[PDB]
Amino acid sequence: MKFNPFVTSDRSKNRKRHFNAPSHIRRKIMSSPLSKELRQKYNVRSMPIRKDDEVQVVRGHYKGQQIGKVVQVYRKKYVIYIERVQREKANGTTVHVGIHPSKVVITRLKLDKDRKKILERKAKSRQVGKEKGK
Amino acid sequence: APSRNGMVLKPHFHKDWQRRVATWFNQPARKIRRRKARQAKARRIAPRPASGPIRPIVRCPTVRYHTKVRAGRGFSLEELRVAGIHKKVARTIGISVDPRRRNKSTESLQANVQRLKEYRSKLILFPRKPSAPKKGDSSAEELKLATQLTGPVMPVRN
């Protein structure tokens, strides 16, 4: 269990840090698991959600195998918007339904120089841990 | 009001005592903090004894305690003179010295100088420059026998 005397297990404190988190760590909070193929291709498990990667919803009303591209990462509300995850409202227009990034798996990563740097960053640390506990 | 038999009690609680109450909830924390300081000090003086300087043999003053012997503040200047130790060198080699203590009897003086001579024999002196030993000690025994002594140096013993 937790032994570090400088990290708190207080429920009020953890909730306060979570809901008042700055956007640059709200990104880390809003991470998603990768698919089994991606988790095998890269030696990484989770990844912060990105604007233009495409995921499938695994929990809720919109569960299925359909692949939808992320269209908005709305960090203030801790939700992401996906293409076809939407509903009709009263006056006939469509509104995106925000779902938590922990309830999707990333099937494909929007890859730029920065993601690739983070991807090999995480994999290298995992490999060090594997050879430490060998 | 008095009620039947009892002890005439005089509590001293007429003086707004509740504004000056010393709780002891930091006592466990205080014991931890002093123990860290003790351990840090011992590491800082790595081979020197942790408790500190050797203290003299001292007889307790009054007629209640004058059968009992304890440790004093420091060795007297007369004790150092007949032990052959300069009063300014002694503090550099772990001998506490009290300039204001006199020796009214020879037995107390003579007991403390054997304490000094014997401590001098037990003392291992490191050269100021380890490469060049002038008169410190032989490197054969100062290497392996050098160990930080725990507890009071030569504890005073009735």
Partner: protein
């Protein structure tokens, strides 16, 4: 509570000729608070009766001979199956209740081999009872960081720590105790004797040196000796059925005489 709570108002009583209770009243106007009662334990926003104070004497000192004698009772109860079962420790298939394992356990490093040991000593059912007991606490403790509760598991007693603490400690209910530093709070978790204790052989052998025999004083406590029995043979049925007792008795009067209806 705060020493200032309910007493930072400057309120005063209105007197007696104003058709209101003589309680102190908040001075001023232009706010709801004006003219409201203050300072009283019966007043909303007032001071509580006898405010709780930090010098309540939270701690108690217990005589050392008391405390050593609680440990001895706790240890003696942990070797009797009826008492350990009555604590609900599922010691059904345990080979022997003064349960002792080889010193090799002290050098365990992984949780897997700690789990495997408990299964092979038939102590795993106790752990599964701890798992079944994991639920939420009832009441305000959830708001006060005591969200989760669970049953107590077996107690592992060791002489040395060569990794045994790290190997265990992720197993719910398992508490590890050094034999030289026994805690009555851990041996009798609720004040009830009979906790299941698995002993390491080195810890088991040090037990005589730690508390002594009735013919040896403890060699690691410098002044302690085992408490003495005020009743050597606590077998009431055997004592009462002994021919010495039975010879001295009068015959039992087993006929019941019920009230006679006065005809």
């Amino acid at each position: 509570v705060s020493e200032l709570a309910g007493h930072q108002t400057s309120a005063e009583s209105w007197g007696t000729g104003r058709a209101v209770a003589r309680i102190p009243r908040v001075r001023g106007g232009g706010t709801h608070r004006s003219g409201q009662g203050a300072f009283g334990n019966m007043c909303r926003g007032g001071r509580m009766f006898a405010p709780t104070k930090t010098w309540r004497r939270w701690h108690r000192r217990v005589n050392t001979t008391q405390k050593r004698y609680a440990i001895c009772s706790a240890l003696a109860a942990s070797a009797l199956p009826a008492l350990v079962m009555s604590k609900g420790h599922r010691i059904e298939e345990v080979p022997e209740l003064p349960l002792v394992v080889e010193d090799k356990v002290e050098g365990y490093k992984k949780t897997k081999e700690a789990v495997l040991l408990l299964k092979k000593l038939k102590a795993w059912n106790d752990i599964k009872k701890v798992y079944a007991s994991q639920r939420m606490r009832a009441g305000k403790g959830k708001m006060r960081n005591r969200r989760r509760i669970q049953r107590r598991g077996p107690c592992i007693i060791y002489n040395e720590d060569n990794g045994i603490i790290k190997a265990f400690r992720n197993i719910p209910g398992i508490t590890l105790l050094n034999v030289s530093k026994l805690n009555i709070l851990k041996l009798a978790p609720g004040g009830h004797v009979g906790r299941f204790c698995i002993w390491t052989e080195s810890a088991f052998r040090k037990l005589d040196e730690l508390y002594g025999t009735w013919r040896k004083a403890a060699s690691l406590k410098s002044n302690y000796n085992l408490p003495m029995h005020k009743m050597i043979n606590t077998d009431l049925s055997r004592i009462l059925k002994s021919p010495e007792i039975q010879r001295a008795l009068r015959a039992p009067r087993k006929k019941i005489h019920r009230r006679v209806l006065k005809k």
